[PDB]
């Protein structure tokens, strides 16, 4: 696996039942969020770990055809069959870096 980006974000998931975002992994705070490329089958994943205690709070596949919603310049989100994910980026620069790499992934899948 090769990291194609690193971006600072608080990783959220949406709790539909209570219509609230909650911190991924139950752990408030920022993570270092990568997109990793597995070249052997040209697959990509989003993997994020808490800056402080290194807990993996997101590890999801990026499917071909994903709709990546840039809701704001610092909060981007997407959904799959099971969950909705949000990234509250530490800065616009982080959001741009991540969105660049995500859009690249989605274009070569």
């Amino acid at each position: 696996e090769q990291s194609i980006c690193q971006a600072r974000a608080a990783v959220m998931v949406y709790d539909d039942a209570n219509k609230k975002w909650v911190p991924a992994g139950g752990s408030t705070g920022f993570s270092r969020v990568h997109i990793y490329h597995h070249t052997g089958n040209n697959t990509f994943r989003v993997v994020g770990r808490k800056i402080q205690d290194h807990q993996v709070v997101i590890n999801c596949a990026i499917p071909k055809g994903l709709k990546y919603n840039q809701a704001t310049q610092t909060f981007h989100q997407w959904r799959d069959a099971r969950q909705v994910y949000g990234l509250n980026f530490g800065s616009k620069e982080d959001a741009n870096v991540f969105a660049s790499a995500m859009m690249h992934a989605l274009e070569v899948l």
Binding site: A10, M12, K20, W21, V22, T28, N88
Partner: peptide, 5 residues
């Protein structure tokens, strides 16, 4: 929201 963050 700040309440969620």
């Amino acid at each position: 929201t700040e309440d969620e963050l």
